[PDB]
Amino acid sequence: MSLIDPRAIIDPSARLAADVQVGPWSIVGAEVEIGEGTVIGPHVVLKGPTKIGKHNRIYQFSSVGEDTPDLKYKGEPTRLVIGDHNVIREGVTIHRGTVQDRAETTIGDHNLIMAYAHIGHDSVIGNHCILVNNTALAGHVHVDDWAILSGYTLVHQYCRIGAHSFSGMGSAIGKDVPAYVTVFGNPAEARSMNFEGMRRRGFSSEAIHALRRAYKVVYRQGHTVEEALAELAESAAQFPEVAVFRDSIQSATRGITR
Amino acid sequence: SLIDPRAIIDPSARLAADVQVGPWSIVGAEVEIGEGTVIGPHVVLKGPTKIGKHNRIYQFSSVGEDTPDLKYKGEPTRLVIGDHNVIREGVTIHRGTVQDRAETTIGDHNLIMAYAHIGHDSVIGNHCILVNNTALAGHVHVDDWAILSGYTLVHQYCRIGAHSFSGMGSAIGKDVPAYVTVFGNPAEARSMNFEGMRRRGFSSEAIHALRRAYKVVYRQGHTVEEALAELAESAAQFPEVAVFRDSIQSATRGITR
Amino acid sequence: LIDPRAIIDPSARLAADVQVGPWSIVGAEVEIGEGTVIGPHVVLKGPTKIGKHNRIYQFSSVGEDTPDLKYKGEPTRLVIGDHNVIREGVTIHRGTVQDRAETTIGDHNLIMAYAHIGHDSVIGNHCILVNNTALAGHVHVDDWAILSGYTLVHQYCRIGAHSFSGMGSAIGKDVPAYVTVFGNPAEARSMNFEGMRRRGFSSEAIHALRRAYKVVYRQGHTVEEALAELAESAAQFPEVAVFRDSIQSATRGITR
Ligand SMILES: O=C(O)CCC(=O)c1cccc2ccccc12
Ligand SMILES: O=C(O)CCC(=O)c1cccc2ccccc12
Ligand SMILES: O=C(O)CCC(=O)c1cccc2ccccc12
Ligand SMILES: O=C(O)CCC(=O)c1cccc2ccccc12
Numbered sequence: 001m002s003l004i005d006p007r008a009i010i011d012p013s014a015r016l017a018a019d020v021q022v023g024p025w026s027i028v029g030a031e032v033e034i035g036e037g038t039v040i041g042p043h044v045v046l047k048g049p050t051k052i053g054k055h056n057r058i059y060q061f062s063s064v065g066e067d068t069p070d071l072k073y074k075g076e077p078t079r080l081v082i083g084d085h086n087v088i089r090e091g092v093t094i095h096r097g098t099v100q101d102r103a104e105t106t107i108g109d110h111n112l113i114m115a116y117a118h119i120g121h122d123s124v125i126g127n128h129c130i131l132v133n134n135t136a137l138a139g140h141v142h143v144d145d146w147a148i149l150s151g152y153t154l155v156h157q158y159c160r161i162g163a164h165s166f167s168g169m170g171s172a173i174g175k176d177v178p179a180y181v182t183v184f185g186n187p188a189e190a191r192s193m194n195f196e197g198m199r200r201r202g203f204s205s206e207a208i209h210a211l212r213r214a215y216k217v218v219y220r221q222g223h224t225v226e227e228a229l230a231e232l233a234e235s236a237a238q239f240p241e242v243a244v245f246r247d248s249i250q251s252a253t254r255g256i257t258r
Numbered sequence: 259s260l261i262d263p264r265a266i267i268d269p270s271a272r273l274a275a276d277v278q279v280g281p282w283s284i285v286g287a288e289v290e291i292g293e294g295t296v297i298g299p300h301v302v303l304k305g306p307t308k309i310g311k312h313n314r315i316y317q318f319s320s321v322g323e324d325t326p327d328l329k330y331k332g333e334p335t336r337l338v339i340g341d342h343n344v345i346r347e348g349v350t351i352h353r354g355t356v357q358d359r360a361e362t363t364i365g366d367h368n369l370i371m372a373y374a375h376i377g378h379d380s381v382i383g384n385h386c387i388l389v390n391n392t393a394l395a396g397h398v399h400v401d402d403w404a405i406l407s408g409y410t411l412v413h414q415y416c417r418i419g420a421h422s423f424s425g426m427g428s429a430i431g432k433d434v435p436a437y438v439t440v441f442g443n444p445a446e447a448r449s450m451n452f453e454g455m456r457r458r459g460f461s462s463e464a465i466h467a468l469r470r471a472y473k474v475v476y477r478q479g480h481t482v483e484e485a486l487a488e489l490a491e492s493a494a495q496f497p498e499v500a501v502f503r504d505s506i507q508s509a510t511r512g513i514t515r
Numbered sequence: 516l517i518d519p520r521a522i523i524d525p526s527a528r529l530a531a532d533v534q535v536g537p538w539s540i541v542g543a544e545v546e547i548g549e550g551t552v553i554g555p556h557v558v559l560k561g562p563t564k565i566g567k568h569n570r571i572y573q574f575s576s577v578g579e580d581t582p583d584l585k586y587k588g589e590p591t592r593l594v595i596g597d598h599n600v601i602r603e604g605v606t607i608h609r610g611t612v613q614d615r616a617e618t619t620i621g622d623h624n625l626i627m628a629y630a631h632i633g634h635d636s637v638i639g640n641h642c643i644l645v646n647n648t649a650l651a652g653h654v655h656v657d658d659w660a661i662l663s664g665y666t667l668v669h670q671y672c673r674i675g676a677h678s679f680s681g682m683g684s685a686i687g688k689d690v691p692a693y694v695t696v697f698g699n700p701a702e703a704r705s706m707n708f709e710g711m712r713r714r715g716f717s718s719e720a721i722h723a724l725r726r727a728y729k730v731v732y733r734q735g736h737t738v739e740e741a742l743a744e745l746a747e748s749a750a751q752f753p754e755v756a757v758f759r760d761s762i763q764s765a766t767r768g769i770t771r
C-alpha cells in the first residue's frame with residue numbers, strides 16, 4: 001500500500017518505510033522517519049528530528065514536529081517520538097522537545113488526537129489516550145494511559161494527567177489530576193471517578209469499590225497526603241488498580257486537583 | 259478558467275458550470291457543488307457530500323471528513339449543505355453516522371466563522387451564526403437565527419432553539435430553549451434575545467407574551483410539567499410562544515437554567 | 516527565495532531578500548519588508564503592509580476581510596511592523612470604515628497558533644498572544660501585554676502595558692497596565708512584577724506600583740479618588756503614570 005504523491009516535498013534525509021502514503025502538498029522534512037503503513041494526508045507539515053512508528057494516520061493542516069514558538073527556547077537538536085496506531089486529526093500542532101528540559105516530546109500507541117489539539121514541547125503521552133478538539137497541553141505535560149481530555153481542555157505546564165482520568169469540556173487544569181479522577185471547570189475541580197471508564201475497560205466490582213474507598217481516603221477525610229498514602233498501602237497491595245491511584249498521589253509534583 | 263488547474267477534482271464529482279475552485283483544493287469522489295459556489299484555495303472536500311448554490315468555503319476548511327468518533331466504522335454516510343452559506347477559515351464539518359440518520363445537515367444563509375466545528379449528525383437550520391471556534395460535539399440541532407458566540411462548546415445531542423444566543427466561552431450541556439440567552443461554563447439562562455426579536459421585526463404583543471412565558475418556565479418554581487400546562491393558553495394564542503413551548507417539550511437533555 | 520510553487524500577484528511589492536514558501540499566496544496590494552520569511556501554505560490578502568524580519572507560519576490567513584455583517588467590501592488596511600512571529604493557522608482581519616479602517620500590529624510581537632486578531636484591533640510592541648487567543652474587534656493591546664492560551668477579548672476592550680491574562684480568561688472590560696486577570700468572567704488578582712523585573716524596573720517604581728494597585732483595588736476607593744490619590748506617585752514615576760493613564764482612559768470601566 002505505498003503511494004508517495006509527487007506534489008509532496010520529501011527531504012533527501014527523510015526515511016519512509018514499507019506501505020507509507022504521503023498526500024499532495026505535504027512536507028516530509030529533514031531527519032523525519034515514518035514507519036510501516038503510516039498514512040500522511042495532504043497539506044501536512046512534518047519537521048524533524050522526528051520518528052513516527054507504524055500504522056499512524058496524520059490529517060491535513062497538521063504541523064507535526066515544529067519548534068516551540070518562544071524564541072527563548074532556541075536550542076537544537078530536539079526530538080519528537082510518536083509510536084504506532086495513533087490518529088492525529090485536522091490541524092493538530094505537535095512541538096518537539098527543548099534542550100532546557102527533556103529534549104523530546106513523546107507519544108506512545110493507540111492515541112486519538114482530534115482536530116486542532118496542541119501538544120506542547122516536552123509533553124509525554126502514554127497509550128490509548130483521547131485528546132478531543134482543541135485540547136492544549138502547554139508544555140512538559142504527562143498524560144498516562146486511557147486518559148480522556150474533553151474538547152478545549154487547557155493543561156498548565158508540568159501537570160500530570162493520571163491513567164483513566166477524565167476532564168469535562170473547557171476544563172482548565174492547573175494541578176495534577178490523579179488516576180481515574182473526573183475534573184470540570186475553570187479552574188478545574190475534582191468531581192468523582194471515571195467509574196464508566198473503569199466498567200467499559202473491564203475493572204472488577206471489587207477494584208471499583210476499592211477505588212471509591214480510595215477516593216474518599218484522599219478527598220473527604222481531612223488526612224495529610226502522607227496519612228492518605230499509609231491508609232491506601234493495604235488496598236494498593238491488594239488491587240493494582242488502587243496502586244495506580246496511590247502512585248499518582250505520591251508522584252504529584254505540586255499538589256492534586258481538589 | 260474557474261476550476262484552478264492545480265485543484266484535484268475526482269472524476270465522480272458533479273460541479274455546476276460556474277463553480278470556482280482555487281489552487282491546491284480537493285473535490286473528492288461523490289462531492290456535488292451547486293451553481294455560483296466559490297471554493298477557495300487549500301480546501302479539502304470529501305463525500306458523499308452535496309453543497310448547494312452561492313456558498314463560499316475559505317482556505318484550510320475540511321468539509322465532509324469522517325468523524326473520528328469510535329462508533330463510526332466507515333459506513334457510507336452523507337453531508338448536505340444548502341445555499342448562501344459562508345464557511346470561513348479552517349472550519350471542520352464531519353458526515354453523519356448510521357447510528358443516527360446517516361447525515362450531517364446544514365440549511366441556508368448560515369455564517370460559520372473560523373475554526374468552527376460541526377460534528378457528525380448535527381442539523382443547522384437557516385440564518386444561524388457560529389462565531390470563531392464554536393464546537394458542536396455531534397447530533398446537535400441548531401434552529402433558525404441562533405447566534406453562538408466565539409468558543410461556544412455544545413455537548414452531543416443538545417438542541418439550540420430558534421433566535422437563541424450564547425455568550426462567548428459558553429459551555430452548553432443542556433438544551434437552550436428558543437429565544438433564550440445563555441452565558442458561562444456551565445451555561446446559565448439569563449433572559450430572552452429581545453435585541454434579536456426586534457432586529458427580526460417581531461410584534462410588541464409577541465415579545466410581551468414571550469417575556470411572560472420566560473417567567474412561567476424559569477421564575478415561578480413550576481416543574482417543567484407544570485410550566486408546560488401553564489404555557490398551553492399563550493402557546494395556543496402566539497406562534498412565538500408555541501415555538502418556545504415546543505423547544506421545552508422537545509428538550510431531551512433538560513433545559514438550561 | 517520565492518518558491519516557484521507560490522502565487523505572487525503582479526501588484527504585490529516584495530523587497531530583495533523576502534522568502535515565500537511553496538503553495539503560499541501573496542495577493543494584490545500586499546507589501547512585504549526586508550528579511551521577512553513567508554512559510555508554505557500561507558494566504559496574504561491586502562491592502563496590507565508587512566514590515567521587516569517577520570516570520571509567518573503555515574495555514575495562516577493574514578489580511579482577510581472580517582465576516583462581520585457591518586463590513587461591506589471597502590478598501591480597509593492591515594499594517595504589521597518588524598520582528599513579529601505569526602505561528603500556525605493564525606487569522607488577522609483588516610479594518611472597517613466604522614472605526615479607522617485599519618488593523619495595526621507593532622514590533623517584536625509573538626502571536627501563537629490559531630490566535631485571532633479581529634478587525635480594527637491595535638497591538639503595540641513585545642506582546643505575546645498565546646495559542647487560540649481571540650481579539651473579537653477594536654481591541655487595543657499595549658506594549659509587553661501577555662494573553663495566556665484561549666484568552667477571549669470582547670470588542671472595544673483595552674489591554675494595558677505589561678498586563679497578564681491567565682489561560683481561558685474572558686475579558687469584558689479594560690485591563691489596566693500591569694494587572695493580572697483570570698477566569699470567565701476575568702477578575703483582577705495582582706500586578707505583573709515578573710514583567711517589571713523583565714524591564715529592569717527600579718525597586719522604587721515596583722514599590723510605587725505595588726502601592727498604586729492597593730489604592731485602586733484594596734482600599735475601597737472609587738476610580739476618581741484613586742486617580743486623585745495616584746497623582747503624586749504618577750508625576751514622580753513614569754511607570755505609575757502608565758498604570759494611572761490606563762485607568763483614566765477606561766470610560767468602559769476596569770476589570771475588578
Ligand atoms: O486520502 C487521504 O486523505 C490520505 C492519504 C493521501 O492524502 C494521499 C496519498 C497519495 C495520493 C493522494 C492523491 C490525492 C489525495 C490524497 C492522496
Ligand atoms: O461527553 C463529554 O463530556 C464532552 C463531549 C466532548 O467533549 C466532545 C466529543 C467529541 C467531539 C467534540 C468536539 C468538540 C467539542 C467537544 C467534543
Ligand atoms: O500555565 C502554563 O504554564 C501555561 C500558560 C499558557 O497559557 C501557555 C503557554 C505556552 C503555550 C501554551 C499553549 C497552549 C495553551 C496555553 C499555553
Ligand atoms: O464579544 C464581542 O464583543 C462579540 C461577540 C463574539 O463572541 C465575537 C464576535 C466577532 C468575532 C469574534 C471572534 C472571536 C471570538 C469572539 C467573537
